[PDB]
Amino acid sequence: RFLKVKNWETDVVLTDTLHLKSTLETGCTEHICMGSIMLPTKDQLFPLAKEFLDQYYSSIKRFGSKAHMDRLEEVNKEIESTSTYQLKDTELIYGAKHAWRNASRCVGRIQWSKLQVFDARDCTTAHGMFNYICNHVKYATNKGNLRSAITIFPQRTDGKHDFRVWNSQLIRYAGYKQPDGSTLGDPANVQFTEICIQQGWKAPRGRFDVLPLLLQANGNDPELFQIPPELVLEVPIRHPKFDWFKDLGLKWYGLPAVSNMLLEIGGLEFSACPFSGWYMGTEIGVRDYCDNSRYNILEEVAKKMDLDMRKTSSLWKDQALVEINIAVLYSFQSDKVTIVDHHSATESFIKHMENEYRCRGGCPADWVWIVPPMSGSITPVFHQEMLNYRLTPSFEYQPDPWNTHVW
Amino acid sequence: RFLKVKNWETDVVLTDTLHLKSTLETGCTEHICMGSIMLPVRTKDQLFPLAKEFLDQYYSSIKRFGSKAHMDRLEEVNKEIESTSTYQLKDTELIYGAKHAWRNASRCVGRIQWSKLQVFDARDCTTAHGMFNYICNHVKYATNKGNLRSAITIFPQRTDGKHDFRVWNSQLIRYAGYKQPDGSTLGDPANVQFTEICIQQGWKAPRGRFDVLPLLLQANGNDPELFQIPPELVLEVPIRHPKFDWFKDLGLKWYGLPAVSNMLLEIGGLEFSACPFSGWYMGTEIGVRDYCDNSRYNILEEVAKKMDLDMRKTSSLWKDQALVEINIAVLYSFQSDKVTIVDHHSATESFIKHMENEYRCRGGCPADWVWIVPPMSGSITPVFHQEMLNYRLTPSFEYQPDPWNTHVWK
Ligand code: HEM
Ligand code: HEM
Ligand SMILES: C[C@H](O)[C@H](O)[C@H]1CNc2nc(N)[nH]c(=O)c2N1
Ligand SMILES: C[C@H](O)[C@H](O)[C@H]1CNc2nc(N)[nH]c(=O)c2N1
Ligand SMILES: N=C(NCCC[C@H](N)C(=O)O)N[N+](=O)[O-]
Ligand SMILES: N=C(NCCC[C@H](N)C(=O)O)N[N+](=O)[O-]
Ligand SMILES: [Zn+2]
């Protein structure tokens, strides 16, 4: 059944058929919509594997070819024998690029095809993992000129030899609970910062302490490693008109690199697949800096702006929020570190979406996540109806490693 | 069954059971979610169960479920339906229905006020002039010299779908929109189509930037008629900025009373096609959407320019900067002219407390996240960090085709 999507700002209407190939289930029903909920075998493997291969070969204009059929046969025999199979290089690259392409929560998918894939499937140890990761961080940072990339470690086998990167991101600041009862650093990482301490990490106890990597290979216990400081590009935050901003003492890292997700390609599961691209301003400025549960810096910045914080109707929070995001962008740009603002990012996504509609006949998109956390309606995506559904290959969430590992 | 909802800013988790009483569809399937989609004559037979459901709820709420008063009413209603195909609601039921339609509106963030709603029974109305008189009284009462009071006027329910009462305006008070051969739009672009119809029907437009539109009223299914609202009844607020003295020179102003008038109210199966309702504005409705939407007044560039902001590159966030000031101004003005209004911060905080209270006393509170979260400063309002469950409960306010696309002219 054809579905239509209307942009209420331009009246442009797109027709979606791509949803017809929807695999998994959204979490919604005809009776209830859970759109805003953050998270709603051989017989199983071969079918999934087939869907993927038919998909790949169709993309390379060889659907049905002998190569297509051969490969399809080879995998079956391989699955029937090894109860699993291995992706050829080409299928891995395609799989990862397409997992990104299908990421309904990513606003920067217009860059999906320019992804650098690092095949880390030959890795066997944590040090090996550290080595691959460092090279990933270095290649991707490129001295400020960020380049998207993903490193894929060995796929899951029996589930007891899983490769995992316990960190939620390759680079994040430590969080510590203090005497007062308050929290120093990033509250979002308190638990992990603890797991690292208990493991031996000599935590510095600072506001912005770059966490160590906790790498798990072949189901073994995780090991700690310190990313070469020379490899962690950071931007000191200063304002273009408030010379007092520098006194806030804020700084953030330039490389966003989600590393706790699971990559699925043709039925196979890669539980260690850190990936990186570059920041959209609001991610840091609005969410990391201003979320009540994160660095919660709104009051401070307000004060120094000398504005009436007596009543909410003065919109002092909104006032401050804007200046703060001005500074993040300003800084990154001043130090020549790649970064994109919500206006450019969202406009780009709209274009990508239009391309995706005429070239794929659709584009899965999660409105709740696509629309920036600030100035929502003044960005194009706000007025754009979206259809959300799941397509594989995909990036999925997965239980925290510490919540299920057998030490 | 039980469905959990979590607030990622407090870790507070709520359990929903109310969704079980959900009857209608959502547009969402098990394979596809359409949460961001704007808008995805009954038989005498299908009517009784609906009436029953509604009545069982009414009586349950007044704590007389199963009583003789309850039983006889069902008997009375079923009888009436069979013999007349329809049925009339008792005043008490109508007031209960209206309050609950509001109580169930998943796109409304001001529901903490649902219980305090003034219901005006206009069911004895038979003509447009009569509807005009009724609306005038609604506007005067609700406005209350700037101290707004929520209220709704309910005109005769649908019968055969041929004698429908309709308020052609989308809001009782709204500014006209005119398209110039130039291609530009004068006034409110959103009301261009309706404006043309008014002119075609006989209205003589002042052709200005903020012309209060005339009421186009349809009674008992007859052709719509024009009426101008008594100017002394239309409260307006000129918009000025607390610190930007040039703001007042932007020539901006807006009306104080928001009153959607094109929705359909459904109570116990009964359909009320003319049910204008009003409460008070949340600042962002005017400051963000009405003033800054590209397809509305679109004042950003001008407010930006006059603020002398670097508009050479979006990354300077001049748009975001201007937007705040403009919303600063809408709020300030209303407060200065003592006209009720609430900012998005207060409004969303209150809604969270309302929502929590609703989970504890009702077992849920259907909410549309896409609509509840404000069009600016999204994540610095609690609703953003709040998971919500959207589902439909009756009584309800529904959308309905524009009268001009269905009306059989006489
Ligand atoms: C090149 C620049 C990129 C930009 C500017 C971009 C931007 C974004 C933004 C703003 C989010 C929301 C983040 C949050 O709220 O936590 C996001 C989420 C996401 N992006 Fe992208 N992205 C980019 C590259 C990538 C890459 C390289 C991949 C994969 C190969 C990817 C996969 C995803 C996924 C899986 C999510 C959702 C993660 C989650 O659920 O927490 N993105 N992206
Ligand atoms: C006391 C003042 C009230 C406030 C501050 C409030 C606020 C809001 C806001 C911000 C919206 C979204 C508007 C938009 O984006 O166009 C809305 C929607 C809604 N409200 Fe309320 N509301 C209030 C009173 C009422 C009343 C009295 C009723 C009904 C009796 C009601 C029924 C609804 C409905 C049905 C919608 C959705 C309308 C649509 O789909 O366009 N509200 N409300
Ligand atoms: C409860 C709600 O789902 C939650 O706050 C979502 C909303 N939208 C979001 N959007 C993005 N990009 N990132 C997030 O973490 C969230 N959080
Ligand atoms: C396409 C999208 O559904 C649309 O822009 C919605 C988003 N949220 C909204 N929220 C409110 N309150 N009002 C609106 O008009 C909208 N528009
Ligand atoms: N932009 C990206 N964001 C991933 C999550 C980062 C998180 N919001 C934060 O630290 O703010 N990914 N990427 O570009 O690969
Ligand atoms: N607040 C209310 N809003 C109704 C819609 C008004 C519209 N967004 C606008 O004119 O901006 N309802 N109410 O209070 O009854
Ligand atoms: Zn849904």
JSON list of N, CA and C and ligand atoms in Angstrom, two decimals, chain A residues 34-39 105-107 280 282-283 287 291 366-373 397, chain B residues 5-9 369 373 379 382-388, ligand 3:
[
{"chain": "A", "resi": 34, "resn": "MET", "atom": "N", "xyz": [3.67, 4.50, 19.99]},
{"chain": "A", "resi": 34, "resn": "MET", "atom": "CA", "xyz": [4.74, 4.69, 20.95]},
{"chain": "A", "resi": 34, "resn": "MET", "atom": "C", "xyz": [5.91, 5.46, 20.33]},
{"chain": "A", "resi": 35, "resn": "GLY", "atom": "N", "xyz": [5.59, 6.31, 19.37]},
{"chain": "A", "resi": 35, "resn": "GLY", "atom": "CA", "xyz": [6.59, 7.10, 18.69]},
{"chain": "A", "resi": 35, "resn": "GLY", "atom": "C", "xyz": [7.64, 7.78, 19.56]},
{"chain": "A", "resi": 36, "resn": "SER", "atom": "N", "xyz": [7.27, 8.18, 20.78]},
{"chain": "A", "resi": 36, "resn": "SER", "atom": "CA", "xyz": [8.22, 8.86, 21.67]},
{"chain": "A", "resi": 36, "resn": "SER", "atom": "C", "xyz": [8.89, 7.99, 22.72]},
{"chain": "A", "resi": 37, "resn": "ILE", "atom": "N", "xyz": [8.73, 6.67, 22.62]},
{"chain": "A", "resi": 37, "resn": "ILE", "atom": "CA", "xyz": [9.37, 5.77, 23.57]},
{"chain": "A", "resi": 37, "resn": "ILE", "atom": "C", "xyz": [10.79, 5.55, 23.05]},
{"chain": "A", "resi": 38, "resn": "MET", "atom": "N", "xyz": [11.78, 5.87, 23.89]},
{"chain": "A", "resi": 38, "resn": "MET", "atom": "CA", "xyz": [13.19, 5.76, 23.52]},
{"chain": "A", "resi": 38, "resn": "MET", "atom": "C", "xyz": [13.57, 4.37, 22.98]},
{"chain": "A", "resi": 39, "resn": "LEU", "atom": "N", "xyz": [12.94, 3.33, 23.50]},
{"chain": "A", "resi": 39, "resn": "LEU", "atom": "CA", "xyz": [13.20, 1.96, 23.06]},
{"chain": "A", "resi": 39, "resn": "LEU", "atom": "C", "xyz": [12.01, 1.04, 23.34]},
{"chain": "A", "resi": 105, "resn": "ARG", "atom": "N", "xyz": [17.08, 7.57, 12.99]},
{"chain": "A", "resi": 105, "resn": "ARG", "atom": "CA", "xyz": [17.33, 8.61, 13.98]},
{"chain": "A", "resi": 105, "resn": "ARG", "atom": "C", "xyz": [18.51, 9.52, 13.64]},
{"chain": "A", "resi": 106, "resn": "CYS", "atom": "N", "xyz": [19.23, 9.20, 12.57]},
{"chain": "A", "resi": 106, "resn": "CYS", "atom": "CA", "xyz": [20.37, 10.00, 12.14]},
{"chain": "A", "resi": 106, "resn": "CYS", "atom": "C", "xyz": [19.94, 11.08, 11.16]},
{"chain": "A", "resi": 107, "resn": "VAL", "atom": "N", "xyz": [20.25, 12.34, 11.48]},
{"chain": "A", "resi": 107, "resn": "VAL", "atom": "CA", "xyz": [19.88, 13.45, 10.60]},
{"chain": "A", "resi": 107, "resn": "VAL", "atom": "C", "xyz": [20.92, 13.70, 9.50]},
{"chain": "A", "resi": 280, "resn": "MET", "atom": "N", "xyz": [26.71, 17.79, 15.25]},
{"chain": "A", "resi": 280, "resn": "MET", "atom": "CA", "xyz": [25.75, 18.81, 14.86]},
{"chain": "A", "resi": 280, "resn": "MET", "atom": "C", "xyz": [25.83, 19.65, 16.15]},
{"chain": "A", "resi": 282, "resn": "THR", "atom": "N", "xyz": [23.95, 21.54, 18.22]},
{"chain": "A", "resi": 282, "resn": "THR", "atom": "CA", "xyz": [23.01, 21.32, 19.30]},
{"chain": "A", "resi": 282, "resn": "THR", "atom": "C", "xyz": [23.28, 20.10, 20.17]},
{"chain": "A", "resi": 283, "resn": "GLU", "atom": "N", "xyz": [23.91, 19.07, 19.60]},
{"chain": "A", "resi": 283, "resn": "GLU", "atom": "CA", "xyz": [24.19, 17.88, 20.38]},
{"chain": "A", "resi": 283, "resn": "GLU", "atom": "C", "xyz": [24.95, 18.22, 21.64]},
{"chain": "A", "resi": 287, "resn": "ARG", "atom": "N", "xyz": [21.95, 19.66, 24.33]},
{"chain": "A", "resi": 287, "resn": "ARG", "atom": "CA", "xyz": [21.84, 18.45, 25.13]},
{"chain": "A", "resi": 287, "resn": "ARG", "atom": "C", "xyz": [22.93, 18.18, 26.16]},
{"chain": "A", "resi": 291, "resn": "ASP", "atom": "N", "xyz": [21.13, 19.96, 29.22]},
{"chain": "A", "resi": 291, "resn": "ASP", "atom": "CA", "xyz": [20.21, 18.99, 29.79]},
{"chain": "A", "resi": 291, "resn": "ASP", "atom": "C", "xyz": [20.35, 19.12, 31.30]},
{"chain": "A", "resi": 366, "resn": "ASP", "atom": "N", "xyz": [12.70, 9.09, 11.99]},
{"chain": "A", "resi": 366, "resn": "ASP", "atom": "CA", "xyz": [12.09, 9.26, 13.31]},
{"chain": "A", "resi": 366, "resn": "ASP", "atom": "C", "xyz": [12.04, 10.75, 13.62]},
{"chain": "A", "resi": 367, "resn": "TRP", "atom": "N", "xyz": [10.87, 11.36, 13.41]},
{"chain": "A", "resi": 367, "resn": "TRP", "atom": "CA", "xyz": [10.65, 12.79, 13.63]},
{"chain": "A", "resi": 367, "resn": "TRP", "atom": "C", "xyz": [11.10, 13.26, 15.02]},
{"chain": "A", "resi": 368, "resn": "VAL", "atom": "N", "xyz": [10.73, 12.50, 16.05]},
{"chain": "A", "resi": 368, "resn": "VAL", "atom": "CA", "xyz": [11.07, 12.84, 17.42]},
{"chain": "A", "resi": 368, "resn": "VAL", "atom": "C", "xyz": [12.57, 13.06, 17.59]},
{"chain": "A", "resi": 369, "resn": "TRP", "atom": "N", "xyz": [13.35, 12.27, 16.86]},
{"chain": "A", "resi": 369, "resn": "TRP", "atom": "CA", "xyz": [14.79, 12.39, 16.92]},
{"chain": "A", "resi": 369, "resn": "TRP", "atom": "C", "xyz": [15.40, 13.34, 15.88]},
{"chain": "A", "resi": 370, "resn": "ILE", "atom": "N", "xyz": [14.80, 13.45, 14.70]},
{"chain": "A", "resi": 370, "resn": "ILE", "atom": "CA", "xyz": [15.35, 14.30, 13.64]},
{"chain": "A", "resi": 370, "resn": "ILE", "atom": "C", "xyz": [15.30, 15.79, 13.95]},
{"chain": "A", "resi": 371, "resn": "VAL", "atom": "N", "xyz": [14.17, 16.24, 14.47]},
{"chain": "A", "resi": 371, "resn": "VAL", "atom": "CA", "xyz": [13.96, 17.64, 14.83]},
{"chain": "A", "resi": 371, "resn": "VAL", "atom": "C", "xyz": [14.87, 18.03, 16.00]},
{"chain": "A", "resi": 372, "resn": "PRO", "atom": "N", "xyz": [15.77, 19.00, 15.78]},
{"chain": "A", "resi": 372, "resn": "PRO", "atom": "CA", "xyz": [16.72, 19.47, 16.80]},
{"chain": "A", "resi": 372, "resn": "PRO", "atom": "C", "xyz": [16.02, 19.87, 18.08]},
{"chain": "A", "resi": 373, "resn": "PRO", "atom": "N", "xyz": [16.72, 19.77, 19.22]},
{"chain": "A", "resi": 373, "resn": "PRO", "atom": "CA", "xyz": [16.18, 20.11, 20.54]},
{"chain": "A", "resi": 373, "resn": "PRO", "atom": "C", "xyz": [16.04, 21.63, 20.80]},
{"chain": "A", "resi": 397, "resn": "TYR", "atom": "N", "xyz": [20.26, -1.15, 19.42]},
{"chain": "A", "resi": 397, "resn": "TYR", "atom": "CA", "xyz": [20.75, -0.98, 20.78]},
{"chain": "A", "resi": 397, "resn": "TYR", "atom": "C", "xyz": [21.04, -2.39, 21.27]},
{"chain": "B", "resi": 5, "resn": "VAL", "atom": "N", "xyz": [5.98, 4.07, 30.94]},
{"chain": "B", "resi": 5, "resn": "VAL", "atom": "CA", "xyz": [6.44, 5.31, 30.33]},
{"chain": "B", "resi": 5, "resn": "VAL", "atom": "C", "xyz": [7.52, 5.85, 31.25]},
{"chain": "B", "resi": 6, "resn": "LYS", "atom": "N", "xyz": [8.63, 6.26, 30.67]},
{"chain": "B", "resi": 6, "resn": "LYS", "atom": "CA", "xyz": [9.73, 6.77, 31.47]},
{"chain": "B", "resi": 6, "resn": "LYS", "atom": "C", "xyz": [10.12, 8.20, 31.12]},
{"chain": "B", "resi": 7, "resn": "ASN", "atom": "N", "xyz": [10.52, 8.95, 32.14]},
{"chain": "B", "resi": 7, "resn": "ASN", "atom": "CA", "xyz": [10.97, 10.33, 31.97]},
{"chain": "B", "resi": 7, "resn": "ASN", "atom": "C", "xyz": [12.48, 10.24, 32.16]},
{"chain": "B", "resi": 8, "resn": "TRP", "atom": "N", "xyz": [13.23, 10.48, 31.10]},
{"chain": "B", "resi": 8, "resn": "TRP", "atom": "CA", "xyz": [14.67, 10.36, 31.17]},
{"chain": "B", "resi": 8, "resn": "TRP", "atom": "C", "xyz": [15.41, 11.47, 31.89]},
{"chain": "B", "resi": 9, "resn": "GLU", "atom": "N", "xyz": [14.66, 12.39, 32.49]},
{"chain": "B", "resi": 9, "resn": "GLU", "atom": "CA", "xyz": [15.29, 13.49, 33.21]},
{"chain": "B", "resi": 9, "resn": "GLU", "atom": "C", "xyz": [15.13, 13.26, 34.71]},
{"chain": "B", "resi": 369, "resn": "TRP", "atom": "N", "xyz": [3.45, 13.60, 21.54]},
{"chain": "B", "resi": 369, "resn": "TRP", "atom": "CA", "xyz": [4.76, 14.22, 21.78]},
{"chain": "B", "resi": 369, "resn": "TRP", "atom": "C", "xyz": [5.10, 15.25, 20.70]},
{"chain": "B", "resi": 373, "resn": "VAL", "atom": "N", "xyz": [5.49, 18.94, 22.76]},
{"chain": "B", "resi": 373, "resn": "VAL", "atom": "CA", "xyz": [6.77, 19.65, 22.86]},
{"chain": "B", "resi": 373, "resn": "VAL", "atom": "C", "xyz": [6.70, 20.96, 22.05]},
{"chain": "B", "resi": 379, "resn": "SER", "atom": "N", "xyz": [14.21, 20.78, 24.15]},
{"chain": "B", "resi": 379, "resn": "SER", "atom": "CA", "xyz": [14.79, 20.03, 25.25]},
{"chain": "B", "resi": 379, "resn": "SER", "atom": "C", "xyz": [14.98, 20.73, 26.61]},
{"chain": "B", "resi": 382, "resn": "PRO", "atom": "N", "xyz": [10.41, 20.14, 30.27]},
{"chain": "B", "resi": 382, "resn": "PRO", "atom": "CA", "xyz": [10.29, 18.75, 30.71]},
{"chain": "B", "resi": 382, "resn": "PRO", "atom": "C", "xyz": [9.61, 17.76, 29.77]},
{"chain": "B", "resi": 383, "resn": "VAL", "atom": "N", "xyz": [8.63, 18.22, 28.99]},
{"chain": "B", "resi": 383, "resn": "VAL", "atom": "CA", "xyz": [7.91, 17.33, 28.09]},
{"chain": "B", "resi": 383, "resn": "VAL", "atom": "C", "xyz": [8.81, 16.62, 27.08]},
{"chain": "B", "resi": 384, "resn": "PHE", "atom": "N", "xyz": [9.91, 17.25, 26.71]},
{"chain": "B", "resi": 384, "resn": "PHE", "atom": "CA", "xyz": [10.85, 16.68, 25.76]},
{"chain": "B", "resi": 384, "resn": "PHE", "atom": "C", "xyz": [11.44, 15.37, 26.27]},
{"chain": "B", "resi": 385, "resn": "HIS", "atom": "N", "xyz": [11.75, 15.35, 27.56]},
{"chain": "B", "resi": 385, "resn": "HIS", "atom": "CA", "xyz": [12.37, 14.19, 28.18]},
{"chain": "B", "resi": 385, "resn": "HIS", "atom": "C", "xyz": [11.34, 13.18, 28.63]},
{"chain": "B", "resi": 386, "resn": "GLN", "atom": "N", "xyz": [10.08, 13.45, 28.28]},
{"chain": "B", "resi": 386, "resn": "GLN", "atom": "CA", "xyz": [8.96, 12.62, 28.68]},
{"chain": "B", "resi": 386, "resn": "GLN", "atom": "C", "xyz": [8.40, 11.69, 27.61]},
{"chain": "B", "resi": 387, "resn": "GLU", "atom": "N", "xyz": [8.44, 10.39, 27.86]},
{"chain": "B", "resi": 387, "resn": "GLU", "atom": "CA", "xyz": [7.86, 9.44, 26.91]},
{"chain": "B", "resi": 387, "resn": "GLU", "atom": "C", "xyz": [6.35, 9.56, 27.05]},
{"chain": "B", "resi": 388, "resn": "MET", "atom": "N", "xyz": [5.64, 9.43, 25.93]},
{"chain": "B", "resi": 388, "resn": "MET", "atom": "CA", "xyz": [4.19, 9.55, 25.95]},
{"chain": "B", "resi": 388, "resn": "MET", "atom": "C", "xyz": [3.50, 8.46, 25.16]},
{"chain": "C", "resi": 3, "resn": "LIG", "atom": "C1", "xyz": [11.29, 10.94, 25.65]},
{"chain": "C", "resi": 3, "resn": "LIG", "atom": "C2", "xyz": [11.83, 11.30, 24.32]},
{"chain": "C", "resi": 3, "resn": "LIG", "atom": "O1", "xyz": [11.73, 10.18, 23.44]},
{"chain": "C", "resi": 3, "resn": "LIG", "atom": "C3", "xyz": [13.34, 11.62, 24.38]},
{"chain": "C", "resi": 3, "resn": "LIG", "atom": "O2", "xyz": [13.52, 12.75, 25.22]},
{"chain": "C", "resi": 3, "resn": "LIG", "atom": "C4", "xyz": [13.97, 11.78, 22.99]},
{"chain": "C", "resi": 3, "resn": "LIG", "atom": "C5", "xyz": [13.38, 12.92, 22.16]},
{"chain": "C", "resi": 3, "resn": "LIG", "atom": "N1", "xyz": [14.16, 13.25, 20.97]},
{"chain": "C", "resi": 3, "resn": "LIG", "atom": "C6", "xyz": [15.48, 13.01, 20.93]},
{"chain": "C", "resi": 3, "resn": "LIG", "atom": "N2", "xyz": [16.18, 13.33, 19.79]},
{"chain": "C", "resi": 3, "resn": "LIG", "atom": "C7", "xyz": [17.50, 13.13, 19.67]},
{"chain": "C", "resi": 3, "resn": "LIG", "atom": "N3", "xyz": [18.16, 13.44, 18.57]},
{"chain": "C", "resi": 3, "resn": "LIG", "atom": "N4", "xyz": [18.16, 12.58, 20.71]},
{"chain": "C", "resi": 3, "resn": "LIG", "atom": "C8", "xyz": [17.56, 12.20, 21.95]},
{"chain": "C", "resi": 3, "resn": "LIG", "atom": "O3", "xyz": [18.26, 11.70, 22.85]},
{"chain": "C", "resi": 3, "resn": "LIG", "atom": "C9", "xyz": [16.17, 12.44, 22.00]},
{"chain": "C", "resi": 3, "resn": "LIG", "atom": "N5", "xyz": [15.46, 12.08, 23.23]}
]
